[PDB]
Amino acid sequence: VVLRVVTVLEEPFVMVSENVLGKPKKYQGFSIDVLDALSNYLGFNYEIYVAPDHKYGSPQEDGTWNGLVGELVFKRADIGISALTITPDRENVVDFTTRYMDYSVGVLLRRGTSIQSLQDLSKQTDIPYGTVLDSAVYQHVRMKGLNPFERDSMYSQMWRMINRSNGSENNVLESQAGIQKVKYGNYAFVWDAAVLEYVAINDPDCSFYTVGNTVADRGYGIALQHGSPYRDVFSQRILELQQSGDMDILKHKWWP
Template sequence: MLKHDYKVRTGNNQYEGFLVDLIKEVANMLNFQYDIYLVHDGKFGSKKADGNWNGMIGELISGNATLALGLLSITSQREEAVDFTKPFMIRYITVLMKVTKSTTSYFEFLNPLHPFVWFCTIGALLFVIIVLYVLERIGNINRTDYPSISFKECFWFVFGSLLHGSTDASPSTLSGRILTASWWFFALILILSYTANLTAFLSVKTINTPIKTVTDLASQTRIKYGTVKSSGTSGFLKNTDIEHFAKMWAQMSEIEPSSMVDTSEVGFKKVKEGNYAFIWDTTVNKYKTIEDCDLMEIGPPFDPQGLGISVPTGATYTEEFSMAILKLNDTGRISEMERKWWVHRNCPDYSNPSTDKTSGLQIENVAGVFFILVGGVAIAAVLCLGDYIAKRILKSVKKEKVHAISPEGDDI
């Protein structure tokens, strides 16, 4: 990789990364000097239609380079053109995607019930109020000891029962009490169901990714996916006989050719934009997820390939390089360099779709209930003020009428 301040640096000091450290260790062991440069076309190396090679393999064949460092997987086709050292690492292929963000709402407490259920509940509330009022009026027509409750009292009694509240008025007829008992049972089941779902919605955050495994890509078309053209990954997908991988290759290369990218950097940019999955080497994908917690890696890993340093065919120093790599591996130096560049990821683990992450409630989750409380306080205050003003006006009018009548009862 280029260092963040590479413009003020020169030569090999412009670059950093695992392979930069690796070649530095090998150079110290074998006592040689080297210069790093980037291949002009940005390719790893694939055979063109005319039989020539592009990318880093082409640079080796043409004699411009004596070593090629990169994600060069050791394949049979490349072995025909150049030589490789012993593998310094085994790489796999995984999928890189953007983490699906969970949305929050101020009125998230309404989510436990479907909007249609809320509509039916309001309808049931109004229906029971009307029926209870009618039953009480009919049942108490000829009774003076139990006067029927008013429509307003019916409303507050039914509404209060739904919220486990209480009122002074209550049904006095047998039919009204039977209706009330059925309404209480309805309210009990509804409140228990709502409470159970509300706990799940507000207290438990479930990581729900649209793609849980690599094979899920083949069975959907909403999320686009692709890889780098003329790369080892594209070669595997193109030549494999595994059904779902072959289906994915047909989707990428024929149905959605725009999903294929020229360089890995373009692929990572498309992932950041969203609705795109990038099929690439797990060594890079894992590093990207460490750098950015908005990205996640999806497995299981497939197509294991050895990564080696590529050299021109017949190079006399191939065996020396291989022995140096084996010694670095035996002494644990390669493992140390891996830990340096692939540190522990301090992000939520989105790779396990069955894991629930419990989190504390934030204000954006429950702000709606505060809005309702403030709204109730405001409405109550306005009604109270209006009632006070109305009573003051009515009292003032009555007082004026009293002063306007003489003690003898004659108008003044």
């Protein structure tokens, strides 16, 4: 029994280890190890392909979904292995396992800063900051900073910085671009805290520092087709990995 796995590249969750003839051959990462834990225990083999648009998946004008979620809806893949945020929107078109990673937001800073939190970052302007355009972080700051019900001045000030020149000045098109901008410029990059911790830990110049708060009731899960016969056993195994302390060994392999 061979499963077809769709993924989205995101260090250190899913990283392409080897390319042959212009296509990835081997994948590694925390999400890959969780997949390898499921495959060996439940007794299935798999093959992995990257989502063509490199997107996670969001609803479109016409109802259809794009990205990884779209690949599962159109049944072009059986399961999705990535840092895919569990949302009610997505739970309506694909089946999610239980959470295997906690959602977290953080900021990447040049070595030698006073910034301790996202709160601090919002209260200064000397270090410009931003994220990836139209990403999760971006859309959250935009929503909170434009919501008349919200009166947390942090999201209002952050959106003011992020949306300078309609977002062309302080944002980037890829996370790699944001990281290099911190490395070689005066900039702070807001992203998933777990990603940024991996980046900081592994930078050859050790030029980064990172702070971030985790977010409860938010996290990443494995996705499957709607009405998949594999969800329940997938979710059970994830619990088992958690109780046995196997998940904390995987997390320590990538976040020592």
